[PDB]
Design an enzyme around this catalytic site. Structure first.
Site, PDB file in Angstrom:
ATOM      1  N   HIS A 134       0.359  -1.171   0.523  1.00 37.46           N
ATOM      2  CA  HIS A 134       0.110   0.123   0.285  1.00 37.46           C
ATOM      3  C   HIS A 134       0.882   1.454   0.033  1.00 37.46           C
ATOM      4  CE1 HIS A 134       1.078   0.293   4.578  1.00 37.46           C
ATOM      5  NE2 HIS A 134       0.249  -0.575   4.489  1.00 37.46           N
TER       6      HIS A 134
ATOM      7  N   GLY B 203       2.147   5.804  11.054  1.00 37.23           N
ATOM      8  CA  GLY B 203       3.503   6.017  10.463  1.00 37.23           C
ATOM      9  C   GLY B 203       4.457   4.628  10.732  1.00 37.23           C
TER      10      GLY B 203
ATOM     11  N   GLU C 166       0.342  -8.268   0.391  1.00 30.19           N
ATOM     12  CA  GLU C 166       0.571  -7.040   0.832  1.00 30.19           C
ATOM     13  C   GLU C 166       2.058  -6.355   1.338  1.00 30.19           C
ATOM     14  OE1 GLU C 166      -2.117  -5.204   1.103  1.00 30.19           O
ATOM     15  OE2 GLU C 166      -1.157  -3.531   0.870  1.00 30.19           O
TER      16      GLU C 166
ATOM     17  N   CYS D 152       3.785   1.469   9.713  1.00 29.55           N
ATOM     18  CA  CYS D 152       3.310   0.348   8.675  1.00 29.55           C
ATOM     19  C   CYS D 152       5.471   0.544   8.297  1.00 29.55           C
ATOM     20  CB  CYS D 152       2.926   1.091   7.161  1.00 29.55           C
ATOM     21  SG  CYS D 152       0.870   0.477   7.471  1.00 29.55           S
TER      22      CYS D 152
HETATM   23  C1  XNV Z   1       0.543   2.313   8.025  1.00 31.14           C
HETATM   24  C2  XNV Z   1       0.494   3.082   7.833  1.00 31.14           C
HETATM   25  C3  XNV Z   1       0.327   4.481   7.681  1.00 31.14           C
HETATM   26  O1  XNV Z   1       1.456   4.825   8.790  1.00 31.14           O
HETATM   27  O2  XNV Z   1       0.569   5.858   6.836  1.00 31.14           O
HETATM   28  C4  XNV Z   1       1.678   5.900   5.766  1.00 31.14           C
HETATM   29  C5  XNV Z   1       1.915   6.839   5.646  1.00 31.14           C
HETATM   30  C6  XNV Z   1      -0.957   1.836   8.495  1.00 31.14           C
HETATM   31  C7  XNV Z   1      -0.809   1.151   9.915  1.00 31.14           C
HETATM   32  C8  XNV Z   1      -1.874   0.520  10.438  1.00 31.14           C
HETATM   33  C9  XNV Z   1      -3.073   2.467  11.094  1.00 31.14           C
HETATM   34  C10 XNV Z   1      -3.838   1.993  12.622  1.00 31.14           C
HETATM   35  N1  XNV Z   1      -3.062   1.168  13.058  1.00 31.14           N
HETATM   36  C11 XNV Z   1      -2.373   0.296  11.900  1.00 31.14           C
HETATM   37  O3  XNV Z   1      -1.597  -0.959  12.922  1.00 31.14           O
HETATM   38  N2  XNV Z   1      -1.503   1.234   7.775  1.00 31.14           N
HETATM   39  C12 XNV Z   1      -2.947   1.060   7.123  1.00 31.14           C
HETATM   40  O4  XNV Z   1      -3.735   2.425   8.114  1.00 31.14           O
HETATM   41  C13 XNV Z   1      -3.648   0.087   6.434  1.00 31.14           C
HETATM   42  C14 XNV Z   1      -3.416   1.133   4.598  1.00 31.14           C
HETATM   43  C15 XNV Z   1      -3.400  -0.824   3.793  1.00 31.14           C
HETATM   44  C16 XNV Z   1      -3.868  -1.656   3.029  1.00 31.14           C
HETATM   45  N3  XNV Z   1      -4.976  -0.276   6.683  1.00 31.14           N
HETATM   46  C17 XNV Z   1      -5.848   0.717   5.628  1.00 31.14           C
HETATM   47  C18 XNV Z   1      -7.545   0.312   5.764  1.00 31.14           C
HETATM   48  C19 XNV Z   1      -8.081  -0.271   6.663  1.00 31.14           C
HETATM   49  C20 XNV Z   1      -7.012  -0.703   7.701  1.00 31.14           C
HETATM   50  N4  XNV Z   1      -7.515  -2.017   8.252  1.00 31.14           N
HETATM   51  C21 XNV Z   1      -8.026  -2.770   7.931  1.00 31.14           C
HETATM   52  O5  XNV Z   1      -8.720  -3.483   7.433  1.00 31.14           O
HETATM   53  C22 XNV Z   1      -8.661  -4.469   9.318  1.00 31.14           C
HETATM   54  C23 XNV Z   1      -8.760  -5.096   9.152  1.00 31.14           C
HETATM   55  C24 XNV Z   1      -8.979  -5.735  10.124  1.00 31.14           C
HETATM   56  C25 XNV Z   1      -9.756  -7.045  10.711  1.00 31.14           C
HETATM   57  O6  XNV Z   1      -8.426  -5.262  11.198  1.00 31.14           O
HETATM   58  N5  XNV Z   1      -7.801  -4.273  10.627  1.00 31.14           N
HETATM   59  C26 XNV Z   1      -5.504  -1.208   7.482  1.00 31.14           C
HETATM   60  O7  XNV Z   1      -4.545  -1.446   7.816  1.00 31.14           O
END
Ligand code: XNV
Length: 178
Positions: free
Chosen positions: A38, A142, A69, A144
């Protein structure tokens, strides 16, 4: 655990900037590194602030055409990564793991995410993602790309969460074989 996590921070973990923001990048071997899919890296990325041309890039999918992913990058830079493929382990069930982050405000960050488990196939960002490792830790924005690992064992790369659980894309040695 902190000593093994510190070794990864000096010799393999970097900050990778795409148009989507900053992500922790784990150098696997040679000039090959991994990043959450992503992040959507283009033809060029920033490695610790330095513009680096992406030689090769391919998103990983399992033999059943299910999203993993994880995106493997090959960088056009001089520094060769330390071969840490020997530490990649698939025996993660119940291991008290550690997330090593070096991106955004979480630079040189070592977190205790508690015991991990193979969640398997879950719905991640409306996309079914396989080989999902779950830990009951409130990972944040932040973070990821953080390296889920323990002493002498590298398990996966953090890809997302829901504010209470966090999920890492499983790392396997077969991903880095042509
Ligand atoms: C990292 C991305 C980031 O920090 O910004 C990038 C510059 C985040 C870390 C997540 C956010 C909240 N807590 C974490 O650990 N990753 C995401 O935001 C990802 C992006 C992708 C793909 N993301 C986006 C939309 C939904 C989710 N989560 C779920 O769908 C989900 C399903 C279940 C079961 O539990 N969670 C997501 O991670």
């Amino acid at each position: 655990n902190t000593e093994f996590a510190l070794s990864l921070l000096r010799k393999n973990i970097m900050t990778i900037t795409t148009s989507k923001g900053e992500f922790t990048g784990l150098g696997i071997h040679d000039r090959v590194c991994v990043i959450p899919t992503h992040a959507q890296p283009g033809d060029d990325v920033l490695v610790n602030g330095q513009k680096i041309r992406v030689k090769d890039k391919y998103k990983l999918v399992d033999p059943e055409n299910i999203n993993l992913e994880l995106t493997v990058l090959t960088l056009d830079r001089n520094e060769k990564f330390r071969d840490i493929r020997g530490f990649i382990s698939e025996d993660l069930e119940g291991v008290d793991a550690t997330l090593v982050v070096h991106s955004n405000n979480f630079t040189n960050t070592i977190l205790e995410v508690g015991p991990v488990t193979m969640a398997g196939l879950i719905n991640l960002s409306s996309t079914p993602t396989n080989r999902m490792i779950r830990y009951d830790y409130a990972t944040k924005t932040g973070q990821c790309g953080g390296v889920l690992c323990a002493t002498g064992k590298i398990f996966g790369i953090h890809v997302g969460g829901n504010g209470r659980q966090g999920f890492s894309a499983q790392l396997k040695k077969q991903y880095f074989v042509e």
